[PDB]
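Hi L.,

You mentioned the student needs an example of a multi-chain input paired with its predicted structure. This one should do, with 870 residues in total across all chains.
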Amino acid sequence: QIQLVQSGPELKKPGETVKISCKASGYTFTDYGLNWVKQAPGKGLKWMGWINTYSGEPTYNDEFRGRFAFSLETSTITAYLKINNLKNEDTATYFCARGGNWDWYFDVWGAGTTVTVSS
Amino acid sequence: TNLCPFDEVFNATRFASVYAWNRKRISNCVADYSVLYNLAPFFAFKCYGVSPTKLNDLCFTNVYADSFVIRGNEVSQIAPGQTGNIADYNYKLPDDFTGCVIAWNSNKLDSKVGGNYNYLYRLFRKSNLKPFERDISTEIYQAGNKPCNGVAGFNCYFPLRSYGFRPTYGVGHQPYRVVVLSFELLHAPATVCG
Amino acid sequence: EVMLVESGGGVVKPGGSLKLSCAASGFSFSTYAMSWIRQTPEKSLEWVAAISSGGTNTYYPGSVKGRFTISRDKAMNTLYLQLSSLRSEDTAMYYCVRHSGNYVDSVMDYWGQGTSVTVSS
Amino acid sequence: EVKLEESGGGLVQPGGSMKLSCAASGFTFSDAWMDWVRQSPEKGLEWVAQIRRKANNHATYYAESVKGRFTISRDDSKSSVYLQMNSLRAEDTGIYYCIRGMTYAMDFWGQGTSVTVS
Amino acid sequence: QIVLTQSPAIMSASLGEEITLTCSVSSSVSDMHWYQQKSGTSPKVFIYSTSNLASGVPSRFSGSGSGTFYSLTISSVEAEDAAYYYCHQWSSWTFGGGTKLEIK
Amino acid sequence: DIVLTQSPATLSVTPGDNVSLSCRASQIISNNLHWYQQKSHESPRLLIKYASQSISGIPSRFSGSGSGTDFTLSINSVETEDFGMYFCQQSNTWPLTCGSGTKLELN
Amino acid sequence: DIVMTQFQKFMSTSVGDRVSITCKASQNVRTAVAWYQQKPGQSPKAMIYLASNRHRGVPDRFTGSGCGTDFTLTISNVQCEDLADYFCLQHRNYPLTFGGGTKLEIK
Ligand SMILES: *[C@@H]1O[C@H](CO)[C@@H](O[C@@H]2O[C@H](CO)[C@@H](O[C@@H]3O[C@H](CO)[C@@H](O)[C@H](O)[C@@H]3O)[C@H](O)[C@H]2NC(C)=O)[C@H](O)[C@H]1NC(C)=O
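Structure written out for the whole complex:
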């Protein structure tokens, strides 16, 4: 039994932050990485940059250079994504996909949470 | 104004191990080394024979870029004249070297909590390497009366030992990706510049 | 003249945070790496942290990963080692040292007088 | 840390038999050529036997001075080495060491056994 | 994973002995430094790169060897040099156990 | 980066046939490209790792070929439950980036 | 079969000089000769494997090489604790021959 079920849908206003969970269970957490991908509707996937699950330091894609934070706590096996200063274009279904520390293919994915922005 | 591929050899995913170092022959550049001088995290930007600040302006004909993965202690062996294990049985530089040596700290990227046993390194040879030569001989050094027929044992040793590469070894023992640029100016009109 | 003034120690309940600081004066601080070295009551030295020259890389051993964080602000000429979620094993006197290159690999030339943090009660 | 400890020290009249064992710890047991050498004060050192790795089908050979009368056996699950010796003569007296692997790296040695004859 | 062995733990010599302080490793490291801790203060640096001396030390201390063995040679120990001596290379995460030096 | 175009953008197929896709690279990416399948509002699954090897769990009809810069994904005996959108995603240079995606619908 | 005669039963040198133990063999033994050092009242330890390399924990003073039939081991700056036996054995053909021993003692 290996799955990564995230939090539910969120709904925030332009300027408020958001926090997205991605809880792992079943596989040994240090044996693989964690990759985040963002998929705007009607477009292709975009890699948000991974997080080494042993130490906890990110490695951002150059598109999402600042303004994001892949924090990590390991007492509970959960990754975290935080988006500061939400703008009006980044509504998506933010997945989190386990890509290995030696392979980098995304086999076991998550359901995906949706952060729409409105007023 | 075609930029030449430093991006294929610097921010790549899988660097090959040190006993079989992949070698990219770069030619017909307009080589923009200013993208290196804005990239912060380089451990060593050491050049032998050329100056780093005058590196953008001089011209070459062919520039070779080797790449491998060594321990952070062994970087102190990618140098003209030094002896050891990496510069004696794996990858040796000549004493009239005219290139640069760049080194990383990839403990984030090339290490699991289990042994990352992909990376190998040579242990011995019957003679020291002539410079700029790779050796992919994979068979057992016998040196005995016994033909042991390809299985390791007493007086039959495999030449390639493997690293562990855990993220808890040491700052000098976690793997450092090392790229060796080696310039040349042999008797031809120059292409690499800019 | 090179001296390393340090402060911030005390006693802390196991499970809380505190700030062990180190002030440097006399050299170009943004071209010399720094590290933190602790010493058990059995007097056996070990690393707990190490930071590069520009603040680009931060290294921690297998014991104190994620709950020890070093920091380095060049303007105030200080050094910050912030701890979190301490056990009873991390009672030690913490020495602020100065490396002799850009990286961590070089010598440790000038040290600090130490700062005692003992967890109990 | 690896060390080998051994036992089975004694004396018996010639024509006897003794099966002395050498236990070990701290290292991977099934990947090793654990040999035995013998130290006597009169002839320097002599080589006793050799048992090879599991992958070499336990290719066991002895010296030509101990043909038939000497045989060795291991069991890597219990991690010990059994050497039984048969119908002995008088000049085989001395200290019999215990070795992890000869003539390569990780060449650790034991402490020997005090076995004697009358 | 590298261990650092300093053998033995307590080594005693009077005024008039020459002595060597050993520090061996598990796998072969290139360099090895040496620190000296008097009782009550911080340890200072004596030797970098196994052979030199820091400025301000007497010229009786000298190191030798490379590979898997490093020895710190004392010419004639005075009452000033009775302290703990730690070897440490960059690639350890640990220090040596420490060899003490006692007058006789 | 490595922009990966897929062509054609739409397909019109019938069940019980063969059809082939394309994912043309920009730089040479030797056998480090993967293929992904995504239906309506689900997570994508992994179809073939490393441009030739198949994955345990999927049916045994998906198998793509080619190496270098031109890659084709070949599905034979297509069924009606293979409806969705298909993603190619390289892994060789950094950062990793996925293709624009083409969809496979039914006549 | 193979006999090794170590023709120095006693070599005696003072502190700080160079000591060279000589060990030549029976026939063409290419590189398969080791060296073992035994402290008095202790088990022997490893010095040099395969006649060139250095075993882990040996000082920098200890090296000695050569191929063919004549092997040697050269100690420079002999210390007070370095009084020991020195054995040389071969493993080319399957009987292994521990040659003669060499005892050192300071004058
Ligand atoms: C290998 O990939 C990394 C990305 O993970 C490249 O780092 C990024 O390279 C771009 C291109 O130069 C940099 O963008 C530039 O940033 C400056 C601001 O400093 C901006 O003014 C420019 O207009 C341009 O957008 C980006 O900063 C840089 N990121 C980091 C963290 O350094 C890297 O360059 C690639 N390797 C090589 C050899 O190109």
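You could point out the following to them. The beta strands of chain C are 3-7, 19-25, 34-39, 45-51, 58-59, 68-71, 78-83, 92-99, 108-110, 116-117. The longest strand of chain C covers residues 92-99.

Best wishes,
N.
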